[PDB]
Design a protein around this ligand. Structure first.
Ligand SMILES: Nc1ncnc2c1ncn2[C@@H]1O[C@@H]2COP(=O)(O)O[C@H]3[C@@H](O)[C@H](n4cnc5c(N)ncnc54)O[C@@H]3COP(=O)(O)O[C@H]2[C@H]1O
Lengths: 179, 179
């Protein structure tokens, strides 16, 4: 049940420090083309396949720019930088949305752990732990609307023809339906 | 035993990506006063008290500068920045050493978890988990001399008159004894 600790680490050491400041950074970018959505969209692939370049996971997800970096002193590191990337979502050659998009990195940690023999984490427990991570993280944000309003969890499982851009657009449009 | 997963997360998502590049960044700073030591000194307070400003933990630990930032694309974030701070260690008004110093942030996560009721982590298990983190992390680096040569773990426990700068200097001088 390592996924439980990674979910809490994900919130304590990240979501709870950037999301209270995200709207400010979003509106700052729009001021100083297209309107960036005001939520952090977090990709939770249950197969734990976490590429580093989204464009390689789906060409329709096209990097646009970066937000204004957030900084802060943490654990003896001066000016620890929290940066986020803005992606355009394409659909049949058209820009259907623009949002701050990224994977949940701890799912990449789960994947790596399953390969290290010293970690005592079997390759078979990847899916189960990924789901415990999603469930735990969802339960955490349910008790912190400050952060829940600032992000949407996009958990998915590829069966083999899958569209990641279409998966994001579904959440991005259901959010605009209640805007 | 959440400490086990945080230790592996600490290595997979950090130590294993900066330490192979640390010497290059150290020597770059010395080129482009005093010689910075060529190891990352990581503070592991077993009481899990992890301030964000080292100078507040001990005035003899004085921030000097930052290293050249390392960057890389991780989990959909373009140019994720890994930064490190250089500290001078004072001793009776004299500069006894200079090194890249910082706390192990996951110990700060353990502390926060113990306060959240939803996390199911008792306040009493802080010390035990801190030690499991130290032990686990030490065992990981023993199997990766690439990273072990590039860092020294400084685990300590305050009894109530403690000197943190003197604690670091002891490790910094034992390393120069076999230089
Ligand atoms: N700037 C950022 N950008 C994107 N995501 C961020 C982030 N800061 C935190 N997170 C998310 O939160 C997790 C836990 O962060 P934490 O700092 O407590 O725990 C971190 C931290 O103690 C250490 N670490 C990683 N990157 C670091 C950095 N740039 N500076 C200092 N420590 C770092 O490794 C642990 C695990 O890192 P990991 O990435 O796997 O897991 C991170 C990551 O998924």
């Amino acid at each position: 049940n390592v996924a439980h600790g990674l979910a809490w680490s994900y919130y304590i050491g990240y979501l709870r420090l950037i999301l209270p400041e995200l709207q400010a950074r979003i509106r700052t970018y729009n001021q100083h083309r297209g309107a960036v959505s005001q939520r952090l969209y977090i990709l939770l692939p249950l197969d734990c396949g976490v590429p580093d370049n989204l464009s390689m996971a789906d060409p329709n997800i096209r990097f646009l720019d970066k937000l204004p970096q957030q900084t802060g002193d943490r654990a003896g590191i001066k000016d620890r930088v929290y940066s986020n990337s803005i992606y355009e979502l394409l659909e049949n050659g058209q820009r259907a949305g623009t949002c701050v998009l990224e994977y949940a990195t701890p799912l990449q940690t789960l994947f790596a752990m399953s390969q290290y023999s010293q970690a005592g984490f079997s390759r078979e427990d990847r899916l189960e732990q990924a789901k415990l991570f999603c469930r735990t993280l969802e339960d955490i944000l349910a008790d912190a609307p400050e952060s829940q309003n600032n992000c949407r969890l996009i958990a998915y499982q590829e069966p083999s023809s899958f569209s990641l851009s279409q998966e994001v657009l579904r959440h991005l449009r259901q959010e605009e339906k209640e805007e």
